[PDB]
Design a protein around this ligand. Sequence first.
Ligand SMILES: O=C(NC[C@H]1CCN(C2CC2)C1)C(=O)Nc1ccc(Cl)c(F)c1
Ligand SMILES: *[C@@H]1O[C@H](CO)[C@@H](O)[C@H](O)[C@H]1NC(C)=O
Ligand SMILES: *[C@@H]1O[C@H](CO)[C@@H](O)[C@H](O)[C@H]1NC(C)=O
Ligand SMILES: *[C@@H]1O[C@H](CO)[C@@H](O)[C@H](O)[C@H]1NC(C)=O
Ligand SMILES: *[C@@H]1O[C@H](CO)[C@@H](O)[C@H](O)[C@H]1NC(C)=O
Ligand SMILES: *[C@@H]1O[C@H](CO)[C@@H](O)[C@H](O)[C@H]1NC(C)=O
Ligand SMILES: *[C@@H]1O[C@H](CO)[C@@H](O)[C@H](O)[C@H]1NC(C)=O
Ligand SMILES: *[C@@H]1O[C@H](CO)[C@@H](O)[C@H](O)[C@H]1NC(C)=O
Ligand SMILES: *[C@@H]1O[C@H](CO)[C@@H](O)[C@H](O)[C@H]1NC(C)=O
Ligand SMILES: *[C@@H]1O[C@H](CO)[C@@H](O)[C@H](O)[C@H]1NC(C)=O
Ligand SMILES: *[C@@H]1O[C@H](CO)[C@@H](O)[C@H](O)[C@H]1NC(C)=O
Ligand SMILES: *[C@@H]1O[C@H](CO)[C@@H](O)[C@H](O)[C@H]1NC(C)=O
Length: 339
Amino acid sequence: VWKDADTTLFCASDAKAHETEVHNVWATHACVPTDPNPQEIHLENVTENFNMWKNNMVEQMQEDVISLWDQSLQPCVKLTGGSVIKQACPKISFDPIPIHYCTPAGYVILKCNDKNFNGTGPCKNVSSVQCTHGIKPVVSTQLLLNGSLAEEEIIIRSENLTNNAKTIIVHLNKSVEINCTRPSNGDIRKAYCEINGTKWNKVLKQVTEKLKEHFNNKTIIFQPPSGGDLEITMHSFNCRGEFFYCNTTQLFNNTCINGTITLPCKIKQIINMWQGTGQAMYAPPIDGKINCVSNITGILLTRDGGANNTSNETFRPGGGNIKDNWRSELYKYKVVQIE
Ligand SMILES: O=C(NC[C@H]1CCN(C2CC2)C1)C(=O)Nc1ccc(Cl)c(F)c1
Ligand SMILES: *[C@@H]1O[C@H](CO)[C@@H](O)[C@H](O)[C@H]1NC(C)=O
Ligand SMILES: *[C@@H]1O[C@H](CO)[C@@H](O)[C@H](O)[C@H]1NC(C)=O
Ligand SMILES: *[C@@H]1O[C@H](CO)[C@@H](O)[C@H](O)[C@H]1NC(C)=O
Ligand SMILES: *[C@@H]1O[C@H](CO)[C@@H](O)[C@H](O)[C@H]1NC(C)=O
Ligand SMILES: *[C@@H]1O[C@H](CO)[C@@H](O)[C@H](O)[C@H]1NC(C)=O
Ligand SMILES: *[C@@H]1O[C@H](CO)[C@@H](O)[C@H](O)[C@H]1NC(C)=O
Ligand SMILES: *[C@@H]1O[C@H](CO)[C@@H](O)[C@H](O)[C@H]1NC(C)=O
Ligand SMILES: *[C@@H]1O[C@H](CO)[C@@H](O)[C@H](O)[C@H]1NC(C)=O
Ligand SMILES: *[C@@H]1O[C@H](CO)[C@@H](O)[C@H](O)[C@H]1NC(C)=O
Ligand SMILES: *[C@@H]1O[C@H](CO)[C@@H](O)[C@H](O)[C@H]1NC(C)=O
Ligand SMILES: *[C@@H]1O[C@H](CO)[C@@H](O)[C@H](O)[C@H]1NC(C)=O
């Protein structure tokens, strides 16, 4: 017998003890080796209720990533609470690695295995595991990168679709590579991201049809953010330690519903910390070809209000709350206490 409960989890990874890469260094001192032969018991005729939007696991992973960033990515100048903190800003080696989250004795993680599970409600096929799958602490906005893919159909996730204030999580079932590069040899901060239009437009079309099922077949329209900070109005992410802000206006237009989509990007040194502490400044970009090839596995959308009396539903790319990022991976997990 068991019951829903919250306990301090521990992490596990395959980090290299000799790697200077920040993630490997952190997991080396904060995590333990992964289990080569992990056990997984499938519970038959067992119904369990999940709620990705109220999962303490998310808060804990958030706490780790914050700690990891505080120890690895300390800015030269930190502006928070009216206070000004000045420190060293040494360039580091940055590349996220899979992090497993496990439960201690007396506790076990329940995993929903329903192909089209949407994060909330009862789960028919449930199994018990000691640790979650390897999850990369990839911090980004608008587009979810290097995440897990849906096994069957594209899944729309939301704590309450009827409420436009609640962020929407689109879980893709097919990856779409996005190639971002900062050429060496001008503007050392000017960069660009290349996406396969044909591949993207088709996926975006599938996402559209999917949204129709959830919005009574209302016309689905995409539009670029109306306002807000750059971290939200643009696809912000970290590549090789550099903060990239990409203009995603060519991705979210409703005309192509076929060549190579080239997004105008730019590396920023001054960023609005996702930890919600304030502003932080980092050193200028390093030299050489800064390139990161990521797989788009999800999209964060915010729906416009005041469209009740119309047949249109406008969706814009959003983000800001990195917790939603962890939810897109921890949705099928929950901790229970055993007795
Ligand atoms: O500034 C951001 N979000 C708004 C905060 C304010 C207060 N709040 C935190 C209490 C939870 C959300 C942000 O996401 N920055 C950001 C920075 C770097 C990257 Cl690579 C990125 F993808 C996003
Ligand atoms: C999960 O249970 C359903 C019936 O409720 C079954 O059809 C399916 O095969 C099980 N797992 C999957 C997704 O294969
Ligand atoms: C990118 O996605 C592809 C599947 O489309 C996968 O083979 C590859 O391992 C992914 N790379 C990552 C997650 O870094
Ligand atoms: C992705 O999901 C959609 C439904 O949302 C489905 O029509 C499509 O076949 C899926 N694609 C793949 C490659 O499974
Ligand atoms: C998820 O599935 C449950 C099944 O009861 C449903 O009640 C809920 O509306 C779904 N959530 C979304 C975001 O579609
Ligand atoms: C979902 O959002 C709508 C609109 O704000 C609200 O009226 C409704 O109470 C919400 N549903 C739940 C279950 O809270
Ligand atoms: C990524 O884009 C650059 C152009 O900036 C190109 O030279 C490179 O071959 C691309 N990589 C892949 C794997 O498409
Ligand atoms: C773009 O994607 C399509 C499939 O959607 C593929 O057939 C084509 O080879 C891709 N183009 C490039 C330049 O890789
Ligand atoms: C959308 O339209 C299709 C085809 O008429 C219909 O089968 C389906 O019930 C509709 N979905 C809605 C209104 O959610
Ligand atoms: C994104 O780029 C487009 C290019 O037409 C531009 O019009 C728009 O102002 C840009 N948006 C932001 C957030 O700067
Ligand atoms: C929409 O996206 C396509 C991608 O090829 C781009 O060519 C076009 O200029 C965009 N339309 C806009 C920004 O109005
Ligand atoms: C996504 O994964 C690829 C392959 O490991 C990696 O090269 C790239 O840096 C990752 N992208 C981000 C945004 O971390």
